[PDB]
Design a binder for this molecule. Structure first.
Ligand code: JU6
Ligand code: MG
Ligand code: ZN
Length: 316
């Protein structure tokens, strides 16, 4: 029955193993790419193919047509997680491999392209339901809904308690994509690394490490080849500037990164974001998971490209 194996064209088969892989513009290939990544990083026995495929198409349908936080982002974040898991295969359990690829696919479900801040200022009903990590708690609740549709329980062969464990892996992974939580989590991990107290057999330490892997996967567009990184930056700002428009309509001055009038400062903004967020992220992750080195190196390469843009040597 494991006689039906998923295969990719030669170029994709080789390049999908590299951290900087780009899943391409053919969206009808992204489910196949995802299944392939599950079969190889988990095993062909991890899920029944018919439920997985039905689950994947329900997740796709509950992603929206927004510039950045869309289906392509979900698969892209999932692929970064595949590359981390394939280069660190000894360190993770069967449940974690299983749960972390799904958490990445589902992590921005039903994203409308607005920050937790905008939901709070707009007084969106979701803000009353969840006061912190508003969108992330909605993404997880959307994941549970889909898992609960008929013929969608991809975890049907797990015991009650294993099912509960993997849903807890998934819940914490999706919550950890709230960038507001990342600053505390990374400082804690850094302290624990440099004191030498960090212990991957400690469940609350695993939680923190997985959280950091989630942030690294979520930001992974800063770890692509420069043309990908630069084009993706247009999609991110298209959402930021629409949100800033929406802030102005509420009579609220938007923070600078969401103001389309500060367009010419995008190169300085990116430089800001690389030094304050991205570099520290991939540094701490490489310290803990040495084989994730190419993420840091490609980030450093793109930081150097943004500096190049600031000094007029490149155009954007
Ligand atoms: C938040 C994000 N998330 C990304 C995720 C993936 C890829 C790029 C991503 N870039 C950004 C990003 C983009 C950006 N542009 C800025 N500008 C532009 C022109 C001037 F107004 C300033 C300023 C910032 N400061 C950050 C620093 C960390 O605290 C929050 C704000 N950021 N941050
Ligand atoms: Mg998110
Ligand atoms: Zn995301």
């Amino acid at each position: 029955q494991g006689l039906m194996q998923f295969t990719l064209p030669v170029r994709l088969c080789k390049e999908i193993e590299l951290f900087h892989f780009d899943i391409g513009p053919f969206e009808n290939m992204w489910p196949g790419i995802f299944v392939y990544m599950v079969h190889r990083s988990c095993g062909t026995s991890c899920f029944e193919l018919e439920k997985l495929c039905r689950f994947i198409m329900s997740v796709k349908k509950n992603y929206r047509r927004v510039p950045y936080h869309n289906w392509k982002h979900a698969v892209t974040v999932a692929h970064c997680m595949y590359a981390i898991l394939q280069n660190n295969h000894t360190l993770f359990t069967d449940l974690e491999r299983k749960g972390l690829l799904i958490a990445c696919l589902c992590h921005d479900l039903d994203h409308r392209g607005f920050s937790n801040s905008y939901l709070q200022k707009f007084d969106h009903p979701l803000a009353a339901l969840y006061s912190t990590s508003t969108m992330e708690q909605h993404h997880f609740s959307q994941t549970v809904s889909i898992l609960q549709l008929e013929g969608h329980n991809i975890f049907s062969t797990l015991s009650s308690s294993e099912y509960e464990q993997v849903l807890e892996i998934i819940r914490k992974a999706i919550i950890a994509t709230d960038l507001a939580l990342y600053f505390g989590n990374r400082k804690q991990l850094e302290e624990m690394y440099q004191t030498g107290s960090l212990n991957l057999n400690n469940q609350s330490h695993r939680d923190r490490v997985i959280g950091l892997m989630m942030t690294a996967c979520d930001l992974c567009s800063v770890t692509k080849l420069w043309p990908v990184t630069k084009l993706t930056a247009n999609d991110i700002y298209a959402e930021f500037w629409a949100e800033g428009d929406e802030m102005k309509k509420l009579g609220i001055q938007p923070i600078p990164m969401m103001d389309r009038d500060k367009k010419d400062e995008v190169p300085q903004g990116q430089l800001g974001f690389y030094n304050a967020v991205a570099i520290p992220c991939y540094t701490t992750l490489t310290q803990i998971l040495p084989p994730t080195e190419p993420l840091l190196k490609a980030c450093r390469d793109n930081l150097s490209q943004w500096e190049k843009v600031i000094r007029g040597e490149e155009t954007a």
